[PDB]
Amino acid sequence: FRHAVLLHPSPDGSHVVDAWVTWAWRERNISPELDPYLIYQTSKEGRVYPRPAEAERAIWRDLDALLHYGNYRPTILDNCTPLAQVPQEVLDSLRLRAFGFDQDGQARDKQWFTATTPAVLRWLADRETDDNENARIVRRITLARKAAEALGRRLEKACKEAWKESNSGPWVQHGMSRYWAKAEPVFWNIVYDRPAQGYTPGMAGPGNAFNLVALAAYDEVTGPYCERPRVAKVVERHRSTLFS
DNA sequence: GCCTGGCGACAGCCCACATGGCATTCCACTTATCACTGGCTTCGTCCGCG
Length: 244
Hints:
immune system; 1 chains; DNA-binding; CRISPR-associated protein, Cse1 family; alpha+beta; CRISPR-Cas; 6 strands; two-stranded antiparallel ribbon; part of a larger assembly
């Protein structure tokens, strides 16, 4: 470990009284091979780093554990969860859990959250017990998740690009907060097939349901600043990208 | 006491429009400007003040 701890005991051993947190190494070493658990990302210059936790995705409880219904995927999951592996039925009832600690890479810290996948999503598939309405449920759910995330990144980059341009960002924080808060019930309406705006029950896919929520959150955030024509032109150039 | 009815006489009828018209040119700007600050850690050293 990069950190070295020593805990001074209480005489009974019931508690710790003092603690020493200090370095064990002066020279850092590259740890060989990427960590299976984390989700990685490559960025211009080609450097590979783990995707940071975001407390905005924790606003919608348990969104990361929906990772199973899926581009880039953690290797441990991609070895043990799929069908090349070896178990027979086990894979049907496995369910994913994630521990995320969103914080600064320095000493500031913001939020942590656990996230087990809901057992309702797979159990709603077995209530029926048919090959087709079930594969269609699973297809819908996987489809819903894909739409919500693609427009989550589209909306992050939208707000981020617009904020930088408008001043020649704080818009991203409220953008994502509003996004997942509004995008959470529309997802659960798409799964149950209940009627959600931007969606028609029984449609083959998400149906633009998600693209509408992103536009409403974005327009909710950039709303007071689309007044001046110069800034309004920038904001419009970047909301247009969320039109899909 | 409450409810209802009454208080000269006070006019009637007929009549009501057709037709026509309703504009057109031109002209619509430039320039300059567009903030800062911070909300990490512990410790050590230096400088200032008493």
